[PDB]
Amino acid sequence: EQPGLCGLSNLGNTCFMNSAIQCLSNTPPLTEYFLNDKYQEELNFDNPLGMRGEIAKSYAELIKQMWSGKFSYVTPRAFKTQVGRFAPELLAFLLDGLHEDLNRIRKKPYIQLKDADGRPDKVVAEEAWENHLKRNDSIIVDIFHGLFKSTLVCPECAKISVTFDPFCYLTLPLASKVKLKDCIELFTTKEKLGAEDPWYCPNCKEHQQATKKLDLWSLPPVLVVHLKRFSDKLDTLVDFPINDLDMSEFLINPNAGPCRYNLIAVSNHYGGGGHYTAFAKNKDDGKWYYFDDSSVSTASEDQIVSKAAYVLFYQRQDTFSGTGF
Ligand SMILES: [Zn+2]
C-alpha cells in the first residue's frame, strides 16, 4: 500500500472529522513533523489548556499508521476519544488541541493588548505577533497562524479602535456563481455592525453599531480557507484556483513575501443526509485522490471545484519541502 493512501473508517457520525484528518494528513509540514518524531521533545504535559499531550500523541500514532503503507484504512478511534475530551467548527478545535499539546511556552504570561494609539500598522502588528508568540509558540503556529487587522469606528464617539489578531484559518463570506477572489474581497469590505453583533466601545462603555473592516496583514505557510456555507446551507458554486493563487493584492503589509499558493486539499460537504469527504494531493507522487471514509480513489484536478467544496487548504510556494523558489 502506498503511504498516505489510507482511508478512515466511519465510527458513527463524527461530522467532518475524517475529512479534516485527511486534509491535515496531506499537509506536508505537519505530517513530516510527526513522522520524523519531532513532537516528543515538544509535548506539553502541564498545560491547563491542553490534554497533557494525549491529543498530539494519539494524532501522531494515527499519522504514523496512515503513512506506514501497511493499511488500506485505519480507525481514528483513540484520536476521536481524545478530541472529544478536549471539546464536548471542529477544525478550530483540532488545531487548538494540537497547538496546546505542543506549545513550547510552559506558563503563558498575562499580556495587556494596547490599542494602536495612532502608531503605525507595522509597529502595532509586530507587537501583536510578538505578544502572540509569547503565549503561543508551536508547530501549529508555525504552519497555520497568520495575522489580520480589525478597524472598528464608533458611530457615537468616533474612536478608531485598531487591533491585530491571530488566525488559524480564514472564514470567507460568499458573494449563483462567484470566484474565490470575490469572497476574499467581500471579507475585506467595510460593513456596519448589526444589532445582533454590536461592539463594546471602551470610550463610552456602550454597545455600538460600529463599522468594522478587516484586512490581511500576514499569511501562514498553510492557508486554510473556510467557505461560510452554514449560517440552511448556501450551495453557491465558488470557483477557486488549483495552482498559483496570488494573495499579494489583498495584503496590506508591504514586507510580506511573494505569497503565491497552490491547493493541497479540499474538504467537501454533500446534501446537508449530510456527508463530508476530501480531495487531497499526495506529497509523494503529486497526484490527486478522493478520500471517502475508508475508500480512497484516484481523482483529477478538473473535478475538485464543485458546489460541495467547503474548506480549502493552500500551501505557500516558498514553503514547499524540497524546492526553492
Ligand atoms: Zn465610543
Residue numbers in the entry: 255 to 342, 354 to 440, 755 to 810, 817 to 857, 860 to 912
Please quote the authors directly.
Ubiquitin-specific proteases (USPs)5 are key players in the regulation of important cellular signaling pathways through catalyzing the deconjugation reaction of ubiquitin from substrate proteins. The multifunctional protease USP15 regulates several important pathways in health and disease, including TGF-β, IGF-I, innate immune signaling, mRNA processing, and mitophagy. USP15, USP4, and USP11 share the same overall domain structure, including an N-terminal domain present in USPs (DUSP) and ubiquitin-like (UBL) domain followed by a protease domain that harbors a ∼300-amino acid insertion predicted to contain a second UBL domain. The USP15 catalytic core displays the characteristic USP protease domain fold, including a finger, palm, and thumb region.
After optimization, crystals of space group P21 diffracted to 2 Å resolution and contained one molecule in the asymmetric unit. A C-terminal tail structure unique to USP15 is rich in aromatic residues and folds back onto the catalytic core in the structure and is located on the opposite face to the distal ubiquitin S1 binding pocket. The active-site loop regions between helices α5 and α6, also referred to as the switching loop (SL; including residues Pro342–Gln353; PQFSGYQQQDCQ), and residues between β12 and β13, referred to as blocking loop 1 (BL1; residues Ser810–Arg816; SYSRYMR) that engage in USP distal ubiquitin binding are partially flexible (unrestricted by crystal contacts and not visible in the electron density; indicated as dotted lines in Fig. 1C). As a consequence, the free enzyme structure of USP15 has a largely open catalytic channel conformation for accommodating the distal ubiquitin tail that harbors the two C-terminal glycines. Interestingly, the USP15 structure shows the catalytic triad in an inactive conformation with the catalytic cysteine (Cys269) in the catalytic cleft loop between β1 and α1 (CCL; residues Ser263–Phe270; SNLGNTCF) located ∼10 Å away from the catalytic histidine (His862). In contrast to Cys269, the side chains of catalytic triad residues His862 (on β16 at the C-terminal end of BL2) and Asp879 (end of β17) are “pre-aligned” for catalysis and within hydrogen-bonding distance. Equally, residues in the blocking loop 2 between β15 and β16 (BL2; Gly856–Gly860; residues GGMGG) are partially flexible and associated with higher B-factors, suggestive of higher mobility. As a result, the ubiquitin C-terminal GG tail–binding channel is mostly open in USP15, whereas it is closed in the USP4 structure. The USP15 structure reported here displays a catalytically incompetent open conformation of the ubiquitin C-terminal tail–binding channel with active-site loops not engaged in crystal contacts, whereas a “closed” form of USP4 was previously captured with a pre-aligned catalytic triad.
